[PDB]
Ligand binder design. Structure first.
Ligand SMILES: CCCCOc1ccc(OCCCN2CCOCC2)cc1
Ligand SMILES: CCCCOc1ccc(OCCCN2CCOCC2)cc1
Lengths: 153, 153
């Protein structure tokens, strides 16, 4: 992935997000409710020291679990460590595009986050333009009804 | 779906095809190996009377089953009945885009078929342009290795 947000202000991504669309390099990363990168973002809580705490949902044992993780800051403002989290682009008000990647061929998953339970075509376009550069083999998108549901059921 | 192939010559789609990409209106139509519209085209055998016999693979009971169905012709050369099959576009030599649709909100699945076990970017573009008009919520694509495998494993 060689798109990062120039001049990311991590404090300003704080609060409510909706995982509107997801994509991944391998179908097995997103295909089942329990697929490893099938993670539904709920809220981003950046620390004063500039780390990013993430609240998300995960279908684990036939159940929508609430989960909590801290992404540790790096020397690059748009890159955090868990396995790396890269912030591609955000207007802070509406949408945020991010990817997660490991080290191996690498696993890669990217989401289009939006602030509201609405299909934002403009954001989905930017998400698709960003993905053109990337070797994705599965893409998912969610309707407004599903965005208001635990684990988007 | 309001894109059909003008002047389709069904005889000329005869032979070997590869399901390179699939998309559907609902994630549950494609998400699992056993999802109902997760069908891998192998060969099209059009009848003299102008019907279309389809050989495909389907993961059913933990197994890649070989399956056989006849799509019956209609008054529209680009539309067959099984549940309707619509042929969107084909250059006969390289690619064929088709959709399958039921009657209800309708289930809708579309594929980009190619003649060879190769990622055809030009065909994938035409597939994506055709899908822009359609309410798809899952997209899959397969690599050359998977195209040579039963049920694309
Ligand atoms: C600003 C970008 C937001 C990043 O959001 C996330 C980044 C990584 C995530 O990783 C989830 C970790 C995968 N496992 C899921 C099952 O529980 C253990 C962790 C989740 C959200
Ligand atoms: C030229 C267009 C090719 C159309 O190819 C197909 C059209 C419909 C298909 O329908 C599959 C029927 C769904 N079930 C799968 C499990 O066995 C029963 C049938 C398969 C290929």
């Amino acid at each position: 992935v060689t798109q990062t947000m120039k001049g990311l202000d991590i404090q300003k991504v704080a609060g409510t997000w909706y995982s509107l669309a997801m994509a991944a390099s391998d179908i097995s990363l997103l295909d089942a409710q329990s697929a490893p990168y099938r993670v539904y973002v709920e809220e981003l809580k950046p620390t004063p020291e500039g780390d990013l705490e993430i609240l998300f949902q995960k279908w684990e044992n036939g159940e929508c679990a609430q989960k909590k993780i801290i992404a540790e800051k790096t020397k690059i403002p748009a890159v955090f460590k868990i396995n790396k989290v890269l912030v591609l682009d955000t207007d802070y008000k509406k949408y945020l595009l991010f990817c997660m990647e490991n080290s191996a061929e690498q696993s890669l998953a990217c989401q289009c986050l939006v602030r509201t339970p609405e299909v934002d075509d403009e954001a989905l376009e930017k998400f698709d333009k960003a993905l053109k550069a990337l070797p994705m083999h599965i893409r998912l998108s969610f309707n407004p009804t599903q965005l208001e549901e635990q684990c988007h059921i």
